[PDB]
Amino acid sequence: MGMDLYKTSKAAQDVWNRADNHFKDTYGFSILDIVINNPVNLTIHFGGEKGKRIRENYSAMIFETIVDGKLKTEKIFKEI
């Protein structure tokens, strides 16, 4: 989807680039490899420094929940 336009519009690939590059560096995980061939499963490796930096970044998101006004801080990623 759009991967044709992404091959054509300089002003368009300047979006998928600024996006995946950001995801590539912040979640170790690129969309441009997702859309051009949808994989069934996706394992995220937590390598060396970049790896640890990305894994804490994964664990840094919190799913709050309304319970009697309580902004209950609980973990997005339980297996992490």
Binding site: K24, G28, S30, D33, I44, H45, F46, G47, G48, E49, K50, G51, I54
Partner: protein, 140 residues
Amino acid sequence: EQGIELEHIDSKSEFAHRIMLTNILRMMGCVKKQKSARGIETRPAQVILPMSPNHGTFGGDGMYSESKLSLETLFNRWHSESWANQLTVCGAIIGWTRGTNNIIAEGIEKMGVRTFSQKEMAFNLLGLLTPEVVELCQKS
């Protein structure tokens, strides 16, 4: 190779040097090409170089010394070169493991020295993969 001293270093050694050094170099030199083409940079491959303290201290082992001695130069490069993210060196040691000269092991152990069964030295190198050390290799 045994019995090979300096005037006997020839084909069989120049071959063994490739089995041990320049192809362990081209094993690492060629998982990076695959690490880097996929873009994999968070799953680095810990290398376990079998080293030894025998650097020409024993007799005529052939070119077995400057083979396994020219493997600690694999630290002058993990910091120097570009393959640091895909490979992490974790040197090791051939201690004195019995099996593969076996009749004088009981002799040395009288010098307060430990010699290892293969299953014992198995345990050690295998503890070199423990999730603790894996990080420790992954800083330095």
